[PDB]
Design a protein around this ligand. Sequence first.
Ligand SMILES: [Zn+2]
Ligand SMILES: [Zn+2]
Length: 70
Amino acid sequence: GSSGSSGYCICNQVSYGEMVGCDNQDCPIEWFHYGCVGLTEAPKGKWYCPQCTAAMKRRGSRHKSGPSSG
Ligand SMILES: [Zn+2]
Ligand SMILES: [Zn+2]
């Protein structure tokens, strides 16, 4: 059993250093490192973690989620 860190960022590490809270409160992390996501500096506009933008993108165009059979 590995205990100690709260595992937040995608790297499964504690929430330290300059972190950017995902705009989507629903986000399971809502906290990613700047070096992990690549943010030399705070985002002027709205910033969405790579975990959401990936999901939202699929839901957008080609929104076809039917029954899995075959
Ligand atoms: Zn990280
Ligand atoms: Zn997110």
